Design a binder for this molecule. Sequence first.
Ligand SMILES: Nc1ccn([C@H]2C[C@H](O)[C@@H](COP(=O)(O)NP(=O)(O)OP(=O)(O)O)O2)c(=O)n1
Ligand SMILES: [Mg+2]
Ligand SMILES: [Mg+2]
Ligand code: NA
Ligand code: NA
Length: 326
Amino acid sequence: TLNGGITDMLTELANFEKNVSQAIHKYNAYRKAASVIAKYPHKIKSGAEAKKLPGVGTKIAEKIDEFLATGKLRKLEKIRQDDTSSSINFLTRVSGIGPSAARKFVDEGIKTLEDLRKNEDKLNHHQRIGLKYFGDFEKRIPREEMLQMQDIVLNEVKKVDSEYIATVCGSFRRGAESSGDMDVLLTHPSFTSESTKQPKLLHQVVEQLQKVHFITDTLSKGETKFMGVCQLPSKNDEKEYPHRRIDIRLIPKDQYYCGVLYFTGSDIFNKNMRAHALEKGFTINEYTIRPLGVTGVAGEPLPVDSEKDIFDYIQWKYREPKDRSE
DNA sequence: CCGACGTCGCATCAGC
DNA sequence: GCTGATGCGA
DNA sequence: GTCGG
Ligand SMILES: Nc1ccn([C@H]2C[C@H](O)[C@@H](COP(=O)(O)NP(=O)(O)OP(=O)(O)O)O2)c(=O)n1
Ligand SMILES: [Mg+2]
Ligand SMILES: [Mg+2]
Ligand code: NA
Ligand code: NA
């Protein structure tokens, strides 16, 4: 982090444009600028130096000159002092509250943590839980704890059916020394892109994890995606471990390589890879890479035998998980 | 200059 | 109920 | 907010 100051500022601006302006693209511009500056291995001495990097144009260059001359940014200073903006930025921090709900709550004079705690009747289910665990969700998970959770998830999965494969993804697979949450990709021979030969394949796993008091709550639940809460077990006299977000994704087993590429991220990396795919005339999702036809209707799934194949098709040198941290 | 810019799962709401 | 759009998050 | 065409 040769350029933490700069990338923080841009992240704050990305966050502002997302939560307050509801301008998703400006949010992307910023995340991207921040990303490209983050991997640039020099201490930036000027805005013009930055302007050079793809994704850094004029406005951001100007901001970078201001930031460097003064150590701060007047645009942000203002936004920080704005009441509506501080209020909306806060609320969206609660999981399940986005930009829209955040502005709606503010309108009704609900703007603090205490206002939320006293208005639980006005929150949907996701939002109630995000609020419940507001504090725990702010904390990072050390890898060491990620290893414990892994042991458990994989052992419980083994016990339900020995043919399940569960693979930890996200920032964990990218070798991070800490993670915001746990991401778990699931496969079972009975679920392929051809047929689902067995119902309740994700449910039986959620149930099992619930039954050992690992999954403590549910944010949302479908046939293929789970979003909920989990907690490591503590011993006698130990203060409890914090509650932690867990996402579980059941992917057809023959499409594992696309699923695992997707679920490994980063979010920015995925967006850059998919963008580049389209310029090469392909669309990648979590399932497949397909060609774009002459007018762009997506052709038939191309054969994929590893993560590398997907890189090959779009003419990208392979990148190990630890290098996809954009 | 000027749109074009990643892709999908689930929750929830509106209209029928 | 179904369809399709919007919100939110992966 | 940025940039390719
Ligand atoms: N907008 C997003 C968000 C996530 N994802 C994919 C890539 C992410 O690595 C993966 C898991 O989502 P995630 O948990 O929010 N992020 P990630 O695990 O990469 O970093 P952490 O905050 O978990 O430490 O979903 C995406 O493709 N587009
Ligand atoms: Mg994660
Ligand atoms: Mg996650
Ligand atoms: Na540039
Ligand atoms: Na939120």
